Amino acid sequence: PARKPRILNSDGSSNITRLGLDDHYHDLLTVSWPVFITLITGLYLVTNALFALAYLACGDVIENARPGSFTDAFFFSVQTMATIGYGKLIPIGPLANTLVTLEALCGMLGLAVAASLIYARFTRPTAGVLFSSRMVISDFEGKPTLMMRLANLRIEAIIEADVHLVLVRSEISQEGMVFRRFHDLTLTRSRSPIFSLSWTVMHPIDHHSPIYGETDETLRNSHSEFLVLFTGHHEAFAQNVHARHAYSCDEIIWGGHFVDVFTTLPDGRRALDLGKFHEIAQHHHHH
Amino acid sequence: PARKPRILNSDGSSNITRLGLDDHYHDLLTVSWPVFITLITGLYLVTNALFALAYLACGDVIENARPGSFTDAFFFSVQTMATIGYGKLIPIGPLANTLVTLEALCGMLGLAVAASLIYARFTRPTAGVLFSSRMVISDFEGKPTLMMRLANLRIEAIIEADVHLVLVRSEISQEGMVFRRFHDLTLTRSRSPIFSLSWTVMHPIDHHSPIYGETDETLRNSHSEFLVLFTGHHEAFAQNVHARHAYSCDEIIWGGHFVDVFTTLPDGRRALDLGKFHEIAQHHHHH
Amino acid sequence: PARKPRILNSDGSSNITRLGLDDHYHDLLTVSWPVFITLITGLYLVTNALFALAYLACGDVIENARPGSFTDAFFFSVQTMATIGYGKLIPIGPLANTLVTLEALCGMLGLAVAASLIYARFTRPTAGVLFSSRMVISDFEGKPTLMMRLANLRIEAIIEADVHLVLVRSEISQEGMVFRRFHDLTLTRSRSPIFSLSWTVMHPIDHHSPIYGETDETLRNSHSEFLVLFTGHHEAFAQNVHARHAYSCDEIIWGGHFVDVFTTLPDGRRALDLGKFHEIAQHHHHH
Amino acid sequence: PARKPRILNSDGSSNITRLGLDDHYHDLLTVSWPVFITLITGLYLVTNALFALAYLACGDVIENARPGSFTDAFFFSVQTMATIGYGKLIPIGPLANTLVTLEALCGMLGLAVAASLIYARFTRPTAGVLFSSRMVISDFEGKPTLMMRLANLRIEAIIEADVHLVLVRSEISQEGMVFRRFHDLTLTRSRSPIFSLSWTVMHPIDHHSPIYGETDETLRNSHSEFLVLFTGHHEAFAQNVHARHAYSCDEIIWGGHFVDVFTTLPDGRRALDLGKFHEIAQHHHHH
């Protein structure tokens, strides 16, 4: 009955805190876009600090640079690794040429890699799928059915898309303490070969259903939450995409009916009106 | 009976109009090939307009450029970010060198990214699958079976390919108004481990079938359309591909039989003749 | 009984001849490695022929090049699009600089794309799966079972790998002429979460089997062939791979038993001996 | 009863030794990170050794290089293929210019490819999934159930993840010698639409189970091992990942119960405590 703390947030993210360079690839792609341009911008500097430090490690090898001045070796270093090569700051002798070839080799390895991640980070698209703000439990074809709906926000379609409704709630074990059980709920249409507009997902509540007989109260008490797992291959990106959302007992409108989002234009051509997406019809009795 | 407006077009595209920078990645890959070369061509210009604007923000730092002339700073700017570095327009002092390194850093970030999308846009292949112009309903192994066929237009094969026949038609709810129902039709062979030539898809019409007993009329009236969803992994691209098509009541040849597309060459070696692909045998009674 | 022409070759390729720039992406990746280096090597030349043709379209704009000589404009053109920029052949005036920026823009678009395909073509790996030279039909757990085996030639493993045995043979329709039927044969283990060594695929021949009761003769006569479709995700490439093979009636050793390929090393550690891979035990009666 | 040699190691790797340039792509991605930077660093050198050898193959074509000195042609060669182009070492005549364009063409093909692999090798991520050190067999909902658990070590989640428990043990054929049988064990939850924290996998031991009635002894004797095959699409990388592990008879704690890894923080917010991950509760009788 009483209000409780959310285990999952509306965006299907968790409120559990785990407890714990050693995971660079993940780290690299994982970091905020500024921190990345920072790391890279950094590495770049350090290598030219190293090479500048190399051409000085040997005598005054480059021409037109002042002796022992690291500055000159460093700006040369950028000009040799970025393949600009103006022609003022220039090498001298066999040794300087060898180092330059090496820095050019790296500068080329530098980009090839800076570009790999630059792209990996890039090729992680959203589905632009919209989830309904509530869900309803309402009789459908004479059976109390729990339902929620989602819509594709993009012109381009999503193919072989599918979704999961997963109840989560505390339940006493046959023996021992209480644990939240992961109940994957059976749907009338789990898969959808194509999805461009709107989809009402629904789980009929029959004798086998975890929420069979469950009321608001018993639900509240079981501390039950629901989680939508949507996934599918976006036609637009030619690639996979996903999306999560979470609902709570407060959200479920009982006897709710989603409202038809399909509208006729003045022109008379039909259309989809995402304004009704969250509208839920409800019947009100007297007093 | 009467003619009606198409909900889907032959190319399986929709005639619904939704209603609604905020979606850059999608936008970027989404845009027409000219608009892209335009955006990029543009950004390029703006940055060199910015850098040219930087070397001028400080005194006359570059050598061989006229003072205060933005022009010189800008063409220098392209030569410094594209790593040409002729050696006429050249930096001076510590500050100019630092900016040059920064522009070189960007010019390298610029390409790495311009190349990501250049490739993403590129790696979205067609299946080169051809759909039959009509479909038929014809008895097959003593059961009225709805069928349509598709063929692979490329030498290279498509693997683990599969298709969906999805009837779409207006149907009165158990209560409330009319809605088009998404009937996914059961096929005799949904999957095909490999597909290189021709495939007749078919949905037997038995007691469970949505179109069981349905006639042209009742079909027309139910405003029914059919949609082919083909997908599969092209051997050629080593990658996934798909294709849609739509059919209408007018298209279905009742009692139609697709005509064998397999032909013997003069040499005697057998072959596939895509000329008969759309040919449908029909029996004509008297008068 | 009599020998016949193969519809599929040992490498699971077809002997049907279809009948039929318009398909560039496919074409590009499709072509032989020389033809590719050729197309590219070509395009490169044509553009610099175009740009060289541009700097000449206007007066003598570049310095150190002879007037009206296309040669000079062309080698300059490579040096401006490849971002070498020695500093002999150099622009003059606002117009030359503008074209140079444009060629640099293209030269950078040129690589980004030349690299996309350079990579796409590259990232199409073989599975290095080996197929047995014959197949056998032999009693297994008291049931005549058709079987064939394949092995992974690479240290690295293949995961969620699966295979299809697909009989192909001419069969008279319930009405009309003869057509080859695609019989996908039911296996005892279609999927395999992991595969690194050897796998005997097998299709038990029971009452439901297409080849139930079929003999060599009836098989020969039905002109039956079998096709192995293997697919799976190679751990090595972190990517998908596949492989086909075809067998004929001549190949099937009846009463054949594949011979155990697992061998103990002198060291005593166990090992896999791909020498027995194609060895088939057969029992020989008298006379 | 007696101790035996492990067929699989804890990391799910094999102890079988197979028996056997011809497989470059695999080889390339396969090799240790040093050996790679080596091969490349090498190829680079050889080509410039070739080009340097070309400009010398013809007369003294480049300006500012000493005649017949390969050294000069080689360092020039790096400066022409890396597109630095200082402007000291410079071409002369039509022939030198043509070769330079060719080397620039290659130097650009060189990077495009060096970058393909540089990235392919890069985009092969770990799942950072942790496996429990033992497994248990313990009654669960009144049925002896074999179980093991794994946890996601990364903030980011893994989606549509699934696992396989695969018993492996020597078993006498209906006829002939002994072979290890690949028993894929049926689980209560094979698939999991999402996985971020902890997952107890479990195989109920009923009449159909390979290990039905099996004891430590009979297991030991059957030389049975178990192999966990985990796979799933990491949300972090936007890509697929996998992980193997192996267990032995010694590892299985009979009557074991994994210990709840979920802990409440001082703040009161809940959390996951990977310290209990390997903790197994066991009941101890008297004496």
Ligand SMILES: C[N+](C)(C)CCOP(=O)(O)O
């Ligand atoms: C809603 N659906 C999943 C059953 C049908 C497909 O969605 P849509 O065709 O309206 O875009």
Ligand SMILES: C[N+](C)(C)CCOP(=O)(O)O
């Ligand atoms: C038509 N099919 C899907 C059943 C068989 C495979 O197609 P194909 O082998 O003719 O290219």
Ligand SMILES: C[N+](C)(C)CCOP(=O)(O)O
């Ligand atoms: C043969 N198999 C497919 C059943 C088992 C897995 O193959 P392997 O473990 O011997 O490499």
Ligand SMILES: C[N+](C)(C)CCOP(=O)(O)O
């Ligand atoms: C354990 N599970 C697989 C059933 C549920 C999902 O895992 P998780 O939600 O705890 O990260």
Ligand SMILES: [Ba+2]
């Ligand atoms: Ba350059």
Ligand SMILES: [K+]
């Ligand atoms: K220069």
Ligand SMILES: [K+]
């Ligand atoms: K110069």
Ligand SMILES: [K+]
């Ligand atoms: K230069």
